[PDB]
Amino acid sequence: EKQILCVGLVVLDVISLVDKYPKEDSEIRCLSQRWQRGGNASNSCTVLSLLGAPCAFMGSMAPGHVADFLVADFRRRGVDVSQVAWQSKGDTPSSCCIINNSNGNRTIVLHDTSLPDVSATDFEKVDLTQFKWIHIEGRNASEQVKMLQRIDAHNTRQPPEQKIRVSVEVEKPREELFQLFGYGDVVFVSKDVAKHLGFQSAEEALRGLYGRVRKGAVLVCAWAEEGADALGPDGKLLHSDAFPPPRVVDTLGAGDTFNASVIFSLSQGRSVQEALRFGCQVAGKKCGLQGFDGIV
Amino acid sequence: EKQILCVGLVVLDVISLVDKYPKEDSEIRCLSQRWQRGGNASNSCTVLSLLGAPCAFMGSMAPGHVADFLVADFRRRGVDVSQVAWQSKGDTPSSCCIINNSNGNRTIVLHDTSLPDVSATDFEKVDLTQFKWIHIEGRNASEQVKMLQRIDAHNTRQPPEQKIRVSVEVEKPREELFQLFGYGDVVFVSKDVAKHLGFQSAEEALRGLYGRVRKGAVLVCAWAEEGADALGPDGKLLHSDAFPPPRVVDTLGAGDTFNASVIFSLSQGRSVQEALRFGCQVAGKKCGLQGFDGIV
């Protein structure tokens, strides 16, 4: 059975919950503390795996303690890591995150050696016959365009039933990523890119950005508590409410859980409306849980 | 040569070395990062190892990756882990440590909650004929006294020449530990404890607290830049100046280096006076060093 590939960043977050932020030069105990693999492409694989869809992660890593921990996690959850671009030097990104018990505050100390990004030449070496869906976390745009072009060229030599579906996320606020909009069957734009572009709601954003997508494509924008919306080539704006959990305990990865869910659903041949709804159910559920496990 | 046994915590410390201490609700970018075996008894075994002294660690660990790292590290250093108390489930202690670059202060967010402690039951299964010196990190006091009494019971049927020497560390400001004083030939008390009880200097700390030890014991107190002092049965107050590094960069475990150096010095039949200086020479140098390698 063909897998879903997710190209993006990975990170080891060490998350600590405390009652009060630590005064310098002190030793205090934790309420809780967990080690969690993260990064957008990385979380989507976590969700795709729990939802029972075979998937693969491709990103940059370097050998070391963190990579070892990260690869172990991937494997345990069944995520394929064969396509990973290993680098000669640097460390795989890691961070320690202290979380305040009442204030909700989050201080992050981050270790990141600027590993070269997955390049077009890295992606040339990936055999595409294994994949049914590919999803690219927008980062180094001009290289990623080459990748998307490579996929486009692949699809032209294939019957429709066997074409690879492609999705793209534009989640950081940078001029360079705009070029991604023109590729992919599904394009995810985040609230924060949307608001930074001056848009005040998911409706405006879709209607404002749709002109930038390849013909036939679908633009999706999830707006947290206000649900999620989408716009297709037929111009009807599809909506889903959010599914707020009784208490929102953890938000880290909710957007990644949204995207993976929409991908999974469209992947299973469901409709955009259905996929929007599904994305919202799963994301809301995750928000009432520590990490990703209890989603399914 | 018989082994020195160290009883207490073992921890996988995630050190992050930063420019300035970070402000709450902010994302600072790390200078360097690493994993270190830590925990008080654990660090003392690292130091005891570097001096060339055979040693063994006893504490609670639990199956998983964290234990794999720590155990591996114990072996890299020759430390005997056969006396360890393996639990069936739960997670081995781990922590997030932030070290300042300029001042060199260390801030610890420890996670030592999961596992049950080394019980007095566990300790009876220890062949006391293997060790010449048993050191106990003061933690679960009421069980630790049982262990100490069992050692006292053992010494009774052994001549002065070949009789196990015992020490205790009182490092946390929790009343529960006050009992431990009456046991052990050498009783380490820290600056963090001394100040909690209202003591201004290392001298007044020893004077006030000596009535608490057993007849003929040695009360030690290290006080960072102000060296370290000691008081025995005779009553002559021995002191030592501090040997500061050319540039203080890492304080994390400096106390655990002092203790270890004093224990070592003493077990090799030197005097309290010489022991102190050695504690200060080595503890000091460890402060100009990122890690424990190079302290001798």
CATH number at residue B68: 3.40.1190.20
Cα–Cα distance for residue pair B261/B44, rounded to 1 Å = 8
Q: How many CB atoms neighbour CB A241 within 10 A? A: 12
Q: Which residue has the tokens 């994993």?
A: B35
> B181: which DSSP letter?
G
Cα–Cα distance for residue pair A22/A40, rounded to 1 Å = 29
**Count of alpha carbons within 13 Å of B10, Cβ hemisphere only?**
30
**Count of alpha carbons within 13 Å of B55, Cβ hemisphere only?**
29
Q: Which of B12, B33, B91 to probe by mutation at the A interface, max A CB count within 10 Å?
A: B33
Q: How many CB atoms neighbour CB A277 within 10 A? A: 22
Report whether B181 contacts B150 (CB < 8 A).
Answer: no
Q: Which two tokens stand for residue A208?
A: 């404002």
Determine whether B159 is exposed, middle or buried from the number of CB atoms within 10 Å of its CB (0-12, 13-18, 19+): exposed
Cα–Cα distance for residue pair B223/B195, rounded to 1 Å = 11
Partner residue opposite B35 with nearest CB, options A24, A30, A65: A65
Residue B214 lies in domain: 1-296
DSSP-derived secondary structure for B226-247:
G-EEEE-TT--EEEE-----SS
**Count of alpha carbons within 13 Å of A86, Cβ hemisphere only?**
8
DSSP-derived secondary structure for A50-78:
HTT--EEEE-EE-SSHHHHHHHHHHHHTT
The amino acid at B292: F
Judge: A98–B109 Cβ closer than 8 Å, yes or no.
yes
Q: Which residue has the tokens 């930038």?
A: A212
Nearest to B263 by CA among B22, B44, B78, B104: B44
Report whether B57 contacts B4 (CB < 8 A).
Answer: no
Resolution (A): 2.9
Q: Is A206 helix (H, G, I), strand (E, B) or coil?
A: helix
> A237: which DSSP letter?
E
Q: Which two tokens stand for residue B122?
A: 């566990």
> A271: which DSSP letter?
-
CA distances (Å), B66 to each of A68, B41, B71, B73, in order? Answer: 12, 17, 8, 11
Which chain A residues have a beta carbon less than 8 Å from that of B110? 27-30
Cα–Cα distance for residue pair A83/A67, rounded to 1 Å = 14
Q: Which of B9, B11, B21, B24 to probe by mutation at the A interface, max A CB count within 10 Å?
A: B24
> B80: which DSSP letter?
B
Q: Is B167 helix (H, G, I), strand (E, B) or coil?
A: strand
Judge: B112–A29 Cβ closer than 8 Å, yes or no.
yes
Residue B203 marked ligand-binding: no
Cα–Cα distance for residue pair A20/A31, rounded to 1 Å = 11
Packing angle of the helix pair A40-50, A254-267 (nearest 10 deg): 50
Judge: A29–B113 Cβ closer than 8 Å, yes or no.
yes
Q: How far is B211 from chain A (nearest CA, A)?
A: 29
Report whether A208 contacts A195 (CB < 8 A).
Answer: no
Partner residue opposite A108 with nearest CB, options B14, B27, B105: B27
Report whether A16 contacts A30 (CB < 8 A).
Answer: yes
Which chain A residues have a beta carbon less than 8 Å from that of B96? 14, 16, 33, 96, 98
Question: Which residues 6+ apart lie within 8 Å of A201 measured at CB?
Answer: A223, A226
Q: What angle do CA A295, A82, A40 make, to 5 degrees?
A: 40
Phi, psi of A25 (to 5 degrees): 65, 30
Which chain B residues have a beta carbon less than 8 Å from that of A96? 14, 16, 96, 98
Q: Which residue has the tokens 């107050």?
A: B237
Determine whether B110 is exposed, middle or buried from the number of CB atoms within 10 Å of its CB (0-12, 13-18, 19+): buried
Q: How many CB atoms neighbour CB B121 within 10 A? A: 10
Cα of A271 vs its chain's centroid, Å: 21
Q: How far is B12 from chain A (nearest CA, A)?
A: 12
Q: Which two tokens stand for residue B220?
A: 């030690």
Cα–Cα distance for residue pair A186/A172, rounded to 1 Å = 17
Cα–Cα distance for residue pair B9/B43, rounded to 1 Å = 9
Report whether B238 contacts B251 (CB < 8 A).
Answer: no
Partner residue opposite A33 with nearest CB, options B69, B100, B111: B111
> B178: which DSSP letter?
G
Residue B104 marked ligand-binding: no
SS3 content of chain A, % helix, strand, coil (to 5): 35, 25, 40
Cα–Cα distance for residue pair A118/A140, rounded to 1 Å = 8
State the DSSP H helix or E strand holding residue A186, giving kind and residue range, or none if neither: strand A186-190
Phi, psi of B229 (to 5 degrees): -120, 165
Judge: B113–A30 Cβ closer than 8 Å, yes or no.
yes
Residue A117 marked ligand-binding: no
Partner residue opposite B109 with nearest CB, options A16, A69, A106: A16
Q: Where are the strands (E) in chain B, listed by range?
A: 3-7, 11-18, 27-29, 32-38, 55-58, 60-61, 85-86, 94-100, 106-111, 131-137, 165-170, 186-190, 218-222, 228-231, 237-240
In A, minimum Cα distance to B35 occurs at: A65
The amino acid at A292: F
A-B contacts at Cβ under 8 angstroms = 84
Cα–Cα distance for residue pair B3/B133, rounded to 1 Å = 7
State the DSSP H helix or E strand holding residue B100, giving kind and residue range, or none if neither: strand B94-100
Cα–Cα distance for residue pair A189/A87, rounded to 1 Å = 30
Nearest to B149 by CA among B174, B119, B182: B182
Which chain A residues have a beta carbon less than 8 Å from that of B113? 29-30
Cα–Cα distance for residue pair B56/A198, rounded to 1 Å = 64
Q: How many CB atoms neighbour CB A19 within 10 A? A: 11
CA distances (Å), A80 to each of A41, A42, A66, A67, A291, in order? Answer: 13, 11, 17, 14, 20
Report whether B137 contacts B77 (CB < 8 A).
Answer: no
Phi, psi of B136 (to 5 degrees): -120, 115
Nearest to A191 by CA among A167, A171, A175, A209: A171
Cα–Cα distance for residue pair B62/B84, rounded to 1 Å = 10
In B, minimum Cα distance to A65 occurs at: B35
- The total of structural domains in chain A comes to 1
Show which residues on chain B lie within 8 Å of chain A, measured between beta carbons.
Answer: 14, 16, 18, 21-30, 32-33, 35, 65, 69, 94, 96, 98, 100, 105-113
Q: Which residue has the tokens 């055999």?
A: A127
Report whether B170 contacts B181 (CB < 8 A).
Answer: yes
Burial profile B18-39: b = 16 or more Cβ within 10 angstroms, e = fewer: beebbeeeeebebeebbbbbbb
Report whether A221 contacts A229 (CB < 8 A).
Answer: yes
Show which residues on chain A lie within 8 Å of chain B, measured between beta carbons.
Answer: 14, 16, 18, 21-30, 32-33, 35, 65, 69, 72, 91, 94, 96, 98, 100, 103, 105-112
Which chain B residues have a beta carbon less than 8 Å from that of A21? 24
Determine whether A294 is exposed, middle or buried from the number of CB atoms within 10 Å of its CB (0-12, 13-18, 19+): exposed
Phi, psi of A99 (to 5 degrees): -120, 120
Judge: B96–A16 Cβ closer than 8 Å, yes or no.
yes
Q: Which two tokens stand for residue B238?
A: 């021995």
Judge: B111–A65 Cβ closer than 8 Å, yes or no.
no
Q: Which two tokens stand for residue A41?
A: 């492409």
Cα of B119 vs its chain's centroid, Å: 19
Burial profile B57-70: b = 16 or more Cβ within 10 angstroms, e = fewer: bbbbbbeebbbebb
Partner residue opposite B107 with nearest CB, options A14, A26, A69: A26
**What are the residue ranges of helices labelled H in A243-296?**
254-267, 272-286
In B, minimum Cα distance to A25 occurs at: B107
Q: What angle do CA B242, B246, B249 make, to 5 degrees?
A: 90
